[PDB]
Design a protein around this ligand. Structure first.
Ligand SMILES: CC(C)C[C@H](CC(=O)NO)C(=O)N[C@@H](Cc1ccc2ccccc2c1)C(=O)N[C@@H](C)C(N)=O
Ligand SMILES: CC(C)C[C@H](CC(=O)NO)C(=O)N[C@@H](Cc1ccc2ccccc2c1)C(=O)N[C@@H](C)C(N)=O
Ligand SMILES: [Zn+2]
Ligand SMILES: [Zn+2]
Lengths: 427, 427
């Protein structure tokens, strides 16, 4: 089926770069005429499923030009001479159908110590063989850009790369819409929230998510995939399934509840938190007794000192709540404490966010500073973490009653949504 | 013989995940119809004997569907071409009997540099060969998940893993019951206590335990396996046989007695101990002159500061008793002291359990803190260990008489049960 850029999501940078290619394909003369020479080989780099093959097709379809799809894993295991013969044929079929695009999927499988030499070299000859002015352009995709023989990277061949960057929230939204074209979605499904909740997800991750939501609905023999299926599909993909197996005693469930309710309260009360999306007391995957999902609302590229101080306080909210409520803190907060200490070090040692130490990068060449500076760093780190801690305990003391309500609900229902949470904290 | 999930123990998480598979097998259409695609290859990961083959069979038997058991060690040593031919045959027999399950035991023996290439690749073709909608699903087991060729792990093949986690106490209980189906057990046999006493044990460990108890009863030509056989089988499996060979002088036997009675008293007296199950003065395995078994009663996932302080005191009980009773401490407590120092460091450096040092993770990047902080850590570590020590010596001084009774009994009988121990400490 024909494909254009409207069928690829979240790769705007790469598509803009590829827009010139489309033009060169559409009308080679416009370049040839003034000596603007095109690359003979373009290499798209990124993890599998980022649509690096879809993009190729999208570039041909966007200039209404032939597209010859080939795989670099097909040439592995071929008979002596067969691997080289296939390549010679492909390009012969390209020159005739030119202008066109010649794609080579999983190229790092061929461009990598025997017959693989003949096929690779044969490629190197075909590259050196065709005329770029003919409007012919070879592409290739590879999440394995280092395994490639440096010969293919030499001027005249694959001497250009177009970077295929991971999608932002809006790019993830479009990728979901696309993977959702032929799926029965319930009306309660909000792809914007699912996109918000999958930062770091690429196209192939997003496609798997959609499948996981379908496996979830199919499991219950249902005909529409629902917001529940998506939200649960995200949680499973990230933090594994839901270990409703293990037996947690009532006392430990209280501590877990308080701990989690602690994060959520402090996170909400504090000025710069990302809003809480959900609190769960349900164990998930490899040792994760509870957690608090946030729902971002941004796409921010800078972070401020106050925002990190607020995030630090929230990270200490769990333990603060334990201390204040039970007196006897548990090992549960170890990861919180390590995450918090790590932020403070970074503020003090890289971001120039302590007044004592100044706008200096201490560290990096590894530790390269005196013992006197080392103790000032620790002192500053301790003092930041400690203040955010007291500040968390004060939020706990002040919202004790609503904190109590929140763990009471959580112990009964195991989950509470952020709206309900904001509602309980507003008197 | 037919098998279901009722015949596999302690793998509830994995079985819940596998419940979808069962359904997909039962009625493929329910998925196919809305595009919920299944994995073609599922990989179960875990140590040998965790019933990863039993589970496969359990998934087929739970959907009343054919099961083709194959071994990956059978294809090693095969003639040129034979290894690939076997694979082609297996799947041919699967498509016809579909829906079904195709299992491949010890897959890491084939999916790992000659004929093993043909057989492996032939597998990679058969995978890419069958239709998932047909209701066909390939599984495989491997405690060696890293030795596997990354090709098998690529989407379209073994691109899913279901984690087979080690059983809790209740899971161990069921595994024992199952391995105890066809064994003559005395009435005095309590599988719950044996399950409690084998934390960390997996299915194959539990099966060996049961055998070891049988070897113990057979040795005395008896017809019923007794609680004695089980308890002794545990002690042998963990700490080796009982070295009733070596000759320990009366004076050293006293110190050993006091030392052990020390642990047990302090452990019992202190609020958070796990209850003592048994004290033995009988040497066992590689340099272990005495020891105190505890019988847990929980399945706890959090540990508190007070619980670690109590455990620390108990760990110092042995040496406390030596100091108080003899004046001249021995090298015996070296491992106790190292274990205790290790807990204190961890409380102070990871768990945020000292007030001076705050809820900071010091360490981890290795030591990355000033000399000033290093001395505060040591000072806090020393002060924790020292207080738990004085506290242990005070428990020794206060229960001196019952401590005396306990070593007197121990020197005569060499073993005392926890009930008797609790009885002697209650006036
Ligand atoms: C309320 C808390 C438990 C919630 C906490 C996560 C949290 O901050 N949510 O807000 C959590 O789930 N921790 C886990 C995992 C873990 C990882 C490393 C550790 C290192 C040292 C000590 C304990 C550690 C525990 C745990 O404790 N897991 C238990 C099962 C364990 N590992 O035994
Ligand atoms: C009453 C105690 C003896 C009981 C103690 C265990 C205990 O805490 N039970 O509560 C014990 O059995 N220790 C063993 C093994 C060991 C291991 C490492 C050592 C390092 C330094 C010094 C002595 C070490 C001894 C021993 O001492 N074994 C003797 C045979 C040895 N190794 O010569
Ligand atoms: Zn936490
Ligand atoms: Zn000891």
């Amino acid at each position: 089926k024909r494909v254009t850029f409207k069928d690829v999501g979240g790769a705007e940078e790469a598509i803009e770069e590829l827009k010139e290619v489309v033009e060169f394909l559409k009308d080679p003369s416009k370049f040839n005429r003034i000596g603007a020479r095109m690359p003979k080989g373009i290499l798209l780099v990124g993890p599998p499923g980022t649509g690096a093959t879809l993009l190729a097709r999208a570039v041909a379809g966007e200039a209404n030009v032939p597209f010859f799809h080939i795989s670099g894993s097909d040439f592995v295991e071929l008979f002596v001479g067969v691997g080289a013969a296939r390549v010679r044929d492909l390009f012969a079929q390209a020159k005739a159908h030119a202008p066109c695009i010649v794609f080579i999927d999983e190229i790092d499988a061929v461009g990598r110590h025997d017959e693989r030499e003949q096929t690779l070299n044969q490629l190197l000859v075909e590259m050196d063989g065709f005329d770029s002015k003919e409007g012919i352009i070879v592409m290739a995709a590879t999440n394995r850009p280092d395994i490639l023989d440096p010969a293919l990277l030499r001027p005249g061949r694959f001497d250009k790369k177009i970077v295929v960057d991971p999608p932002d929230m809006l790019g993830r939204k479009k990728i979901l819409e696309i993977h959702t074209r032929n799926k029965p979605l319930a009306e309660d499904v909000n792809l914007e929230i699912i996109a918000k909740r999958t930062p770091g997800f690429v196209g192939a991750d997003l496609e798997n998510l959609v499948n996981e939501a379908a496996l979830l609905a199919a499991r219950e023999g249902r005909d529409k995939i629902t917001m529940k299926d998506f939200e649960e599909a995200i949680d499973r993909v990230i933090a594994g399934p839901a270990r409703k197996s293990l037996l947690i005693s009532p006392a430990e469930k209280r501590i877990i509840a308080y701990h989690e309710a602690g994060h959520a309260v402090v996170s909400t009360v504090v000025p710069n938190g990302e809003p809480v999306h959900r609190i769960s007391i349900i164990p998930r995957g490899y040792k994760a007794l509870g957690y608090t999902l946030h729902l971002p609302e941004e796409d921010k590229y800078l972070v401020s000192r106050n925002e990190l101080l607020d995030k630090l306080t929230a990270l200490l909210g769990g333990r603060a709540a334990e201390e204040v409520v039970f007196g006897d803190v548990t090992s549960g907060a170890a990861n919180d404490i390590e995450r918090a200490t790590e932020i403070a070090r970074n503020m003090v040692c890289q971001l120039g966010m302590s007044e004592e130490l100044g706008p200096l990068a201490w560290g990096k060449r590894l530790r390269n500073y005196s013992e006197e500076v080392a103790s000032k760093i620790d002192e500053e780190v301790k003092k930041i973490v400690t203040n955010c801690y007291e500040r968390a305990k004060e939020i706990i003391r002040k919202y004790r009653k609503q904190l109590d309500n929140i763990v009471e609900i959580l112990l009964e229902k195991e989950t509470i949504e952020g709206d309900e949470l904001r509602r309980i904290l507003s008197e």
